[PDB]
Amino acid sequence: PTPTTLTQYIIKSQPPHSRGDFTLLMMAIQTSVKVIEKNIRRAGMKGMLGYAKLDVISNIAFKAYLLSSTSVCVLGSEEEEQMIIAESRRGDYLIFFDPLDGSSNIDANVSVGSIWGVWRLPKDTTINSVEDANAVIRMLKGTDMVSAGYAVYGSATNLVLTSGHGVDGFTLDPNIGEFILTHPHISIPKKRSIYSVNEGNYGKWEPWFKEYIDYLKMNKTTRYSARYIGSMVGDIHRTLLYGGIFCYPKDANQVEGKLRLLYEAAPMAMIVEQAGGKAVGSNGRILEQSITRLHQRTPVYFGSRQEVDLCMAFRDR
Amino acid sequence: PTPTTLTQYIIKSQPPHSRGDFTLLMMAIQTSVKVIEKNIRRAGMKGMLGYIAAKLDVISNIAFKAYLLSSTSVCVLGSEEEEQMIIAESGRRGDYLIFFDPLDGSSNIDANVSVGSIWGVWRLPKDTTINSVEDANAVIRMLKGTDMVSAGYAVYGSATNLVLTSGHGVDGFTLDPNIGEFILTHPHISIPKKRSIYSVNEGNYGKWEPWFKEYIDYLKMNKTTRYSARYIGSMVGDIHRTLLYGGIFCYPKDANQVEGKLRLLYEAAPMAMIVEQAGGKAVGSNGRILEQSITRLHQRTPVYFGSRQEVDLCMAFRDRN
Amino acid sequence: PTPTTLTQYIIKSQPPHSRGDFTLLMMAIQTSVKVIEKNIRRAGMKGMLGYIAGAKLDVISNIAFKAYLLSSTSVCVLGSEEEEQMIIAESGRRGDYLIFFDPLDGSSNIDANVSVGSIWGVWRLPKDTTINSVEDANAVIRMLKGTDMVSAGYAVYGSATNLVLTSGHGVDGFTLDPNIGEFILTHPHISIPKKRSIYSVNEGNYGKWEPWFKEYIDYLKMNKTTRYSARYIGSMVGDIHRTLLYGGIFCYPKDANQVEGKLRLLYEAAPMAMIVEQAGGKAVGSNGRILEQSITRLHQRTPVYFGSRQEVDLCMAFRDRN
Amino acid sequence: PTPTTLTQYIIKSQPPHSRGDFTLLMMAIQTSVKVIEKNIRRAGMKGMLGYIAGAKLDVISNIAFKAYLLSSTSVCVLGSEEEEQMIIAESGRRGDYLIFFDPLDGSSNIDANVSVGSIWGVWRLPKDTTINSVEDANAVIRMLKGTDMVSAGYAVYGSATNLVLTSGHGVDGFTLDPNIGEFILTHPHISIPKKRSIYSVNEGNYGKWEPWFKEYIDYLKMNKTTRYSARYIGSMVGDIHRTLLYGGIFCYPKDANQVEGKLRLLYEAAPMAMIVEQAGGKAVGSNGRILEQSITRLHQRTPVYFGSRQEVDLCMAFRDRN
Ligand SMILES: Nc1ncnc2c1ncn2[C@@H]1O[C@H](COP(=O)(O)O)[C@@H](O)[C@H]1O
Ligand SMILES: Nc1ncnc2c1ncn2[C@@H]1O[C@H](COP(=O)(O)O)[C@@H](O)[C@H]1O
Ligand SMILES: Nc1ncnc2c1ncn2[C@@H]1O[C@H](COP(=O)(O)O)[C@@H](O)[C@H]1O
Ligand SMILES: Nc1ncnc2c1ncn2[C@@H]1O[C@H](COP(=O)(O)O)[C@@H](O)[C@H]1O
Numbered sequence A: 001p002t003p004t005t006l007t008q009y010i011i012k013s014q015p016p017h018s019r020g021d022f023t024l025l026m027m028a029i030q031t032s033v034k035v036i037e038k039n040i041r042r043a044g045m046k047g048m049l050g051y052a053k054l055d056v057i058s059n060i061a062f063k064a065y066l067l068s069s070t071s072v073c074v075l076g077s078e079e080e081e082q083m084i085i086a087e088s089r090r091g092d093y094l095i096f097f098d099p100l101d102g103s104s105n106i107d108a109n110v111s112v113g114s115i116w117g118v119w120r121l122p123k124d125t126t127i128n129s130v131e132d133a134n135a136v137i138r139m140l141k142g143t144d145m146v147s148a149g150y151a152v153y154g155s156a157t158n159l160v161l162t163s164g165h166g167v168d169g170f171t172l173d174p175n176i177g178e179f180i181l182t183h184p185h186i187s188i189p190k191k192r193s194i195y196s197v198n199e200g201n202y203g204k205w206e207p208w209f210k211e212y213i214d215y216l217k218m219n220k221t222t223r224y225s226a227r228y229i230g231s232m233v234g235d236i237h238r239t240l241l242y243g244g245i246f247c248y249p250k251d252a253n254q255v256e257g258k259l260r261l262l263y264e265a266a267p268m269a270m271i272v273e274q275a276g277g278k279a280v281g282s283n284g285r286i287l288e289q290s291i292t293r294l295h296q297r298t299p300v301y302f303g304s305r306q307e308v309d310l311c312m313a314f315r316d317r
Numbered sequence B: 001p002t003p004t005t006l007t008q009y010i011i012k013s014q015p016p017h018s019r020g021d022f023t024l025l026m027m028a029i030q031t032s033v034k035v036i037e038k039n040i041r042r043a044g045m046k047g048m049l050g051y052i053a054a055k056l057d058v059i060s061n062i063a064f065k066a067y068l069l070s071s072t073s074v075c076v077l078g079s080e081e082e083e084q085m086i087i088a089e090s091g092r093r094g095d096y097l098i099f100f101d102p103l104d105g106s107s108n109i110d111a112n113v114s115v116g117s118i119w120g121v122w123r124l125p126k127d128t129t130i131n132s133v134e135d136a137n138a139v140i141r142m143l144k145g146t147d148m149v150s151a152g153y154a155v156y157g158s159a160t161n162l163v164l165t166s167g168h169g170v171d172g173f174t175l176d177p178n179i180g181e182f183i184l185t186h187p188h189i190s191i192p193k194k195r196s197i198y199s200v201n202e203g204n205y206g207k208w209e210p211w212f213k214e215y216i217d218y219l220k221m222n223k224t225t226r227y228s229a230r231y232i233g234s235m236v237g238d239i240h241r242t243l244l245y246g247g248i249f250c251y252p253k254d255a256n257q258v259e260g261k262l263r264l265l266y267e268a269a270p271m272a273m274i275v276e277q278a279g280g281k282a283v284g285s286n287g288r289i290l291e292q293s294i295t296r297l298h299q300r301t302p303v304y305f306g307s308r309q310e311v312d313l314c315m316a317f318r319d320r321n
Numbered sequence C, D: 001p002t003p004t005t006l007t008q009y010i011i012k013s014q015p016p017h018s019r020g021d022f023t024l025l026m027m028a029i030q031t032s033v034k035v036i037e038k039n040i041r042r043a044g045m046k047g048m049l050g051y052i053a054g055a056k057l058d059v060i061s062n063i064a065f066k067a068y069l070l071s072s073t074s075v076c077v078l079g080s081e082e083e084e085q086m087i088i089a090e091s092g093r094r095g096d097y098l099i100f101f102d103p104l105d106g107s108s109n110i111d112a113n114v115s116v117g118s119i120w121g122v123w124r125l126p127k128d129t130t131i132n133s134v135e136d137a138n139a140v141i142r143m144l145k146g147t148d149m150v151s152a153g154y155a156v157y158g159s160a161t162n163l164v165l166t167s168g169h170g171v172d173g174f175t176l177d178p179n180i181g182e183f184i185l186t187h188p189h190i191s192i193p194k195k196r197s198i199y200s201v202n203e204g205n206y207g208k209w210e211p212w213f214k215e216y217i218d219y220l221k222m223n224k225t226t227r228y229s230a231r232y233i234g235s236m237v238g239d240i241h242r243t244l245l246y247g248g249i250f251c252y253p254k255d256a257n258q259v260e261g262k263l264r265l266l267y268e269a270a271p272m273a274m275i276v277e278q279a280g281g282k283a284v285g286s287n288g289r290i291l292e293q294s295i296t297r298l299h300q301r302t303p304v305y306f307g308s309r310q311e312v313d314l315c316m317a318f319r320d321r322n
């Protein structure tokens, strides 16, 4: 009859006898994304009246709206060294986010994004200090994650999220400023001949991965196409809709990869898994890895299940 | 005092004793870009009215043609998508030929990542006129990229940027969506002489010429300089990054694409003019793209565009084999 | 920390152990208002694509409002002022809310593109009653009063877009921020001043008014104590919105041709009365509070005297002393 | 083929062998109007960024209008209605155009966010004259008449944004398309109807009017031939804009407290008179055409009787027969 907005979708997804905290958290996130997108679309130009980096603005916006929701006890921005504990205005959700992913693409104004992961406090635990929070993040796994999403700020703005019952994607309609459901129940194809990785680091890769990449180029069965925007959110978003593989492997300088576990990889892993893909690191599922440090890094091999299997076959043989 | 709009810039760039036709052509192009950008930002969603009761390629092409044909300044239009040129009806006929790709990076449309529009403007050679496609075919064959009066692109990314040149450098403008004006944000764009970024589809490695394979391996394996790779998959996106950051963009020959992929009139020549005007090099199979002769309308060419020293390194591998 | 959006406000207002139907109804209304506002701001111009390939705003507004309300699953009955009959929602998609609305108030101001609006009132089904037909609905509206109304609101499409609503705990006003397309709380707990020297009525109908009202209007002009200013936009939503924020009085009285006034009870007057009362003003008709009047017909008319409590008292003093 | 933008219209209207200064002035005005409209649509809310880190609309509008006009290099003299003095442009950046404007007309309607506007009139320096000081400018405005005016326009910030202008060859109206931020020609060659039964005036001042005008207003109400409708938004730009498209009359007459009326001659009345006259209406003051009156003071007031030619004739008939 009329198309479904993100606002409707969030409210209609609320199970009976919920507090409404999670719903208010999603509303806060949605509003952040709009504010952040508006500043990005302006490329940070001042208004014509009155004749601030976009990282800084995005981070300020995301924090402000999440702290105003009363649903969080802990915030973690990838940029900042410490977590923020909400005063005690304190729910039981921990949010970890990267507010402006693909920061090297900002000056060219190509695709960039935001990523977030939401965890709930384990039962019979509470956080009054950073030292409590440090203890708590160490006992969390990606499989205990209640929600994940990203926003891609591209030629259009897309918001893609999951609560553990599949993945739904929404496109911002700028006439009325609402996110409209355009990609329901996203299902990443089981195979697709596209790969996404920075081959500038070829010389520093492990031999098994070098062999993998050479096979993609030299094999006689299947021609592969290469794409690498340089923003994880941009590349993953293409990977979800088109199929393929996204890789950021180990290298001589980055022994545990580049991407952060809490802030980027675990959230994206949940989305990719919920869309029917695989999402692995050094040893199986990213969602099963233990958090030891807050800023822990991990390699990633995310995408179409058969494309990730091929990749791991090179590592296993 | 106040920032310069594209509209001001175009009018203030008009040389004394011009007809004003070129100015009206730029205004028409500017308006097209705004209309196209708006449909792209909506990802082609119908209005909420339309849902109770069209590909982006098709819409972009319709928009670009309509505004250019309304300007009274063109005699010939060429859209990359279409097989033939369109001759304007006489009565509404200037002496400009426009060749354009209205939606570059069409494989990126469904993901809604960066895409673009590209155009090149030529003037009729003195003592010539076009009444038919056969006249137009004769005329394009006597044109070179060095006779081009104007070139530009629009990048539809996280912001919308319009970058253009009239032969006196390159200026870039960012769309301010509050007031719908293009504001001068990148005056006199100067592409760095070197930068360690390269842009090419390495999925085609196996089908490349050995000299280019060696080039790419050197970028990866050499011990002096670490290179970063970027390839969005839209020429306008990749070139725009190349102009502001420096680096190199390559679409070389391969076994299946013997003369490369990118069209000479519609894409490569216009981009070559922009890159050259910003201080970079822009070469094909044998020197400057702007010096190549148009034989066919849909003629292809390889491209090696970017920072001068990065394009020199690339050609050094071809010259030493 | 950050300013409150309408979306937050609606969710945070949800009492514990509600079904969430009312919340979904407000979201549907909010979305309608944005869609309607966008078409109004364009003055109904086709897109630049629509022009090369080559709908009244009343029709579009009505289509939008109905579509979003019927998609919410919370209504059983819709009533648009324009249409002769009520619409009963198909069972399967049927809550227990009745919405009566005027989707584009001030229709004579459309061509000039000055202030126009939308108005709605929300009622709940009386306990142990249900509607399967227009004949059931007709029975049910007759047993409703304005005092049984669970919610009322309007949207003003002016130089800015404002949405003003109440659920029986005061009146809050929100301004559309067009950058991000959210309604932001700008006028919390609206309190209409007890007096203000502004009056709003169509004096083109002076000759057809009752003598007591003629005397009232002459007093406003001729008295020696207090100079009054006149304002009449011609859209009830525009005039009432000014009245709420500035104070004053809005009148549409009886006349020779309009014996029971012009404005409809269910669609316009009762919803506005609830808002005005919740903001501290008075809102009366032929005989006391509009909210106490009985609905006899669906399209029943009533005179209105809405506004600042002391300005409405002065007005009624002229009627009571004759 | 495609619809005409204001930008196209301005350039195509440029006569052969013009300097282009006037064209640049119109572009500057157009851009001002968009900037002003955007701040008005936000009701002056700070951005959501501005709120975490923690300006009247009259002040912002005035700053915007001045900045864009001073950046055009085409003006020597600016006059904002709000300010007491004229601004002389610094020499080096000095054309021969004098602009007089009211950047935010209808200031009493700002808080309610109903219709408001901007008005401007453009004059050219008389041949063999120049301005180096306010004292030169004062001499020059005294020798100007409304008939020497090269251009006039207004912007109405209503439910949509309309820009209406004239260069002495009729009146054309443009509606802002907010998708692409361009003014699109929607009302070409505006022709105000010769008669229409609508009148616009503040009847709150009835008691202080001259007897002839009281008789006029009573005739509109009491006569047996023609029923009149009353409309008064309270913003001259809003009321006039309705008058141009619908027909009728707008009046701000003399009163006991305002012996020469309220509206300023240079800033409001003369510009509107030019527009109304160019659309086929009449626009008179105390003694014939407003455009023929002599400027004695900068802030000189005048009564106005603007609108449909037969409606203004009826009005003046009451003054001529007493
Ligand atoms: N809008 C929603 N969409 C999906 N799941 C939800 C929603 N609201 C609540 N839930 C689920 O119910 C849990 C508890 O909700 P709450 O009591 O609101 O914190 C959340 O952690 C979610 O797993
Ligand atoms: N607005 C402008 N900006 C830059 N160059 C222009 C402009 N207008 C005219 N020209 C140059 O002058 C030539 C003739 O202009 P016209 O007579 O308007 O077609 C064009 O081919 C351009 O090279
Ligand atoms: N978001 C809300 N704001 C104010 N009142 C509400 C809200 N939600 C529910 N209510 C009140 O509770 C009643 C029943 O709610 P429901 O069970 O959702 O139909 C409504 O008729 C309202 O009076
Ligand atoms: N774009 C235009 N539209 C209408 N009239 C114009 C335009 N440009 C110039 N004129 C007329 O020509 C006169 C001188 O123009 P200028 O030489 O630009 O100062 C102006 O006062 C106008 O009457």
Ligand SMILES: O=P(O)(O)OC[C@H]1O[C@](O)(CO)[C@@H](O)[C@@H]1O
Binding pocket: A101, A102, A103, A104, A198, A230, A231, A232, A233, A248, A258, B228
């Ligand atoms: O410059 P590199 O090493 O390709 O890294 C790009 C990566 O960095 C990030 O910006 C994270 O820091 C990701 O968005 C992206 O995948």
Ligand SMILES: O=P(O)(O)OC[C@H]1O[C@](O)(CO)[C@@H](O)[C@@H]1O
Binding pocket: A225, B104, B105, B106, B107, B201, B233, B234, B235, B236, B251, B261, B262
């Ligand atoms: O898919 P491929 O072969 O890498 O081609 C991408 C190229 O094709 C184009 O879309 C032109 O057809 C360019 O925008 C881009 O550089």
Ligand SMILES: O=P(O)(O)OC[C@H]1O[C@](O)(CO)[C@@H](O)[C@@H]1O
Binding pocket: C105, C106, C107, C108, C202, C234, C235, C236, C237, C262, C263, D229
């Ligand atoms: O033109 P009139 O008779 O003064 O009526 C105007 C009234 O009509 C309405 O449009 C309702 O029909 C109201 O918005 C407004 O108060």
Ligand SMILES: O=P(O)(O)OC[C@H]1O[C@](O)(CO)[C@@H](O)[C@@H]1O
Binding pocket: C229, D105, D106, D107, D108, D202, D234, D235, D236, D237, D252, D262, D263
């Ligand atoms: O409040 P009053 O006396 O009706 O005056 C309103 C008039 O004042 C103005 O704001 C000019 O000061 C006009 O827009 C309007 O016609």
Ligand SMILES: [Cl-]
Binding pocket: A110, A111, A154, A229, A234, B113, B114, B157, B232, B237
């Ligand atoms: Cl991109």
Ligand SMILES: [Cl-]
Binding pocket: C114, C115, C158, C233, C238, D114, D115, D158, D233, D238
């Ligand atoms: Cl209004």
